[model samples]
Target: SGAIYVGNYRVVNRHLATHNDWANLVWEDSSRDLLVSSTTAQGCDTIARCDCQTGVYYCSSRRKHYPVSFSKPSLIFVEASEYYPARYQSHLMLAVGHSEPGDCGGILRCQHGVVGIVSTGGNGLVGFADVRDLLWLDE
Candidate 1:
């Protein structure tokens, strides 16, 4: 809500945990990896960063600026599946969860390489996936 509070990163729905190839790669040019991480901090001149993997999504602004968020906690690994129709596109169903309170704790959705924040009822909001495109706190 509220324009995502500026400088914050929202967790992609599928990346909140691992996802199926269909859900992760439906976008013609998207990465095959369900979660991608930055080796270096995006906006900070100094180096503090967040790295993500199959089950881990971690980020630290070094208290400088750019924010980050994720969903559910103690996220247990679950299976995912997809189905396509002759006259329609494909859809995916994934099983994931979050049970802890942490910075950037929210649900996000990704489509065609863009990620967005989602409401509690599962609505999408404008979100950030790249820091290069926006002004940073350090700037």
Candidate 2:
């Protein structure tokens, strides 16, 4: 009846396919919460960086876990709505949506493939997270 802890994970501290938006902040508990990812290559990690042509496209959000009462799958196309850019502390946006029901980290799948993750939504619009590269690490 609730989410369970599978385990714990440390921040990924590895080189990326691209330079980091920022580096580890040693100030915060030895940089434990550093915004890091081992996305060594640009797979599907960014909308502006993918190998696809952006156009009138279709997308859907599939959700699980507690499966909140209204958190049902929605098929959406060609429409923009309001949202908060999660990458920024208080950035605002109005990306397209279709009564997009998501958040609690649901999966964002486009017709082509699994595009990204649904991060925040009360939607006016839903904010998505680009996969941003495969998580690979080496010693």
Candidate 3:
């Protein structure tokens, strides 16, 4: 095996989901390191504008999907491991930070539903993109 392992580099496959969160998923380009999703409604390719309740967002992320503004309580529920589909070998968390994983704060979830908020995916890359970021509707 030509694999060089000094210590350990673990790779995990996690399908993070959000519920009741004011979010808009966007994708990035690891090669050019550019945001493929547009922030303004006139720039990006104009994809689906997912809703907070029963939203729907198109999968254009060639790699990642940053779902922003997830419901606080839903994120909390996800983090507390109270929702369905418990995190076992893998971990699900609230996407937060200034970059891909924003630091704005939100909730986490799995295939089932949200659990809680564990971090913050702040006001990330938007406005200058070429995609349509969904608009949030208050329930």
Candidate 4:
């Protein structure tokens, strides 16, 4: 893998289709409404500039700079449950998929008013790419 080439706005816009969240990690922090727009264009080699219900400003960035090699397309999502012991320390969690089959992804342990990208995980790279929508989760 190589560093992400932002290219044109089109390139940045393409990421909007990726997974997005509703403001803060706590579902309640936001209106449960996705914070990204489907009809958006523009990107940054660093991060996407958008809005958040609370905490830090929101944005999307491509995983192009992962700099590591991957064999297949990745599935990303935000995981929340009282089931995980780590959740006891942190209420919100970010999940990342890995190289193994059905044996990837993990919650990132971060201490912040909002832990957005605590960890991309050794396998699963959590967080948004360009844009995100909850409806896409059904897909």
Q: Listing every candidate in turn, what is its Cα RMSD in Å to the true structure after a full C-alpha superposition?
A: 14.2, 12.4, 17.9, 14.9
- Residue 42, candidate 3: how far off, in angstroms? 36
Q: Which scores better on TM-score, 2 or 4? A: 2
lDDT of 3: 0.23
lDDT of 4 by residue, 1-139 (tens): 1112222221121112234422212121121211232223333333223233222212222221122212121233334533222222222223333322111111111122211222223345433222212222112
Candidate with more favorable, higher TM-score: 1 or 3: 1
Candidate 3 local lDDT, 1-139, one digit each (tens): 0000111111011123232111432432221112222123222112233333222111122233344443212212222222223322211222232333331122222333322222222254211111112121100
Candidate 4: misplaced stretches above 4 Å? 1-35, 38-66, 74-119, 122-139
> lDDT tens digits, residues 13-77, model 1?
33343344234332221221123222222321221122221122222212222223433222222
Q: How far off is residue 7 in model 3, in Å?
A: 46
lDDT for each candidate structure: 0.25, 0.28, 0.23, 0.24
Judging by TM-score against the true structure, name the best candidate: 2
Count clashes in each candidate, considering only residues at least 3 apart in sequence or on different chains. Answer: 9, 4, 44, 12
- Greater TM-score among 2 and 3 belongs to 2
What lDDT score is found at residue 37 in candidate 4? 28
lDDT score, candidate 1, position 46: 23
